[PDB]
């Protein structure tokens, strides 16, 4: 399934995954393309925060879907 993930800067990425892939797995894919760790990547969609244990099918995410990408920002 060729889906698209848009970011906040204004850039979309083509992520080839399946309807049974976990959100954490998708974050790892963006980490291999952009170069950012998955812990610093959140997947939002339809005004809803996607869980790392849930998959793409759990959120009715189909092919060519535009998923929003957020950046984790905490202390440390």
């Amino acid at each position: 399934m060729q889906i698209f993930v848009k970011t906040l800067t204004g850039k979309t990425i083509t992520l080839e995954v399946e309807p049974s892939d976990t959100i954490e797995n998708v974050k790892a894919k963006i980490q291999d393309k952009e170069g950012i760790p998955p812990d610093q990547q959140r997947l939002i969609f339809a005004g809803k925060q996607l869980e790392d244990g849930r998959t793409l099918s759990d959120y009715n995410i189909q092919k060519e879907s535009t998923l929003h990408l957020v950046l984790r920002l905490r202390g440390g």
Binding site: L8, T66, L71
Partner: protein, 111 residues
């Protein structure tokens, strides 16, 4: 009947199915904490005057640097879509606003 399973209860039993009900119960618990903290701190201040804040001078500048520096940095320049100022929910408030209130494309691909 032959029902009795994951159908009779799919909204008032698991909050994972609806974050609106999970957040609603989280907003109520937070309110009880405000009254338990505003009242717990009020008693801690009246007692600190006896044996807690006994100092004849002035040492309230360390937090002033933390508040003054973050007061102008957290809320000062806003002439650009900065992301460092928006937290994970503030950035989500903007990313979620475009997912529901940002479908201005035309008739080719929209959700």
């Amino acid at each position: 009947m032959l029902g009795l399973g994951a159908s009779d209860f799919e909204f008032g039993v698991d909050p994972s199915a609806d974050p609106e009900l999970a957040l609603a119960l989280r907003v109520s618990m937070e309110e009880q904490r405000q009254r338990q903290e505003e009242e717990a701190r009020r008693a801690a201040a009246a007692s600190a005057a006896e044996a807690g804040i006994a100092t004849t001078g002035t040492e309230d500048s360390d937090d002033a640097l933390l508040k003054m520096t973050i007061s102008q940095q957290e809320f000062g320049r806003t002439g650009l879509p900065d992301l460092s100022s928006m937290t994970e929910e503030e950035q989500i408030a903007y990313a979620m606003q475009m997912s529901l209130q940002g479908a201005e494309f035309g008739q080719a691909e929209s959700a």
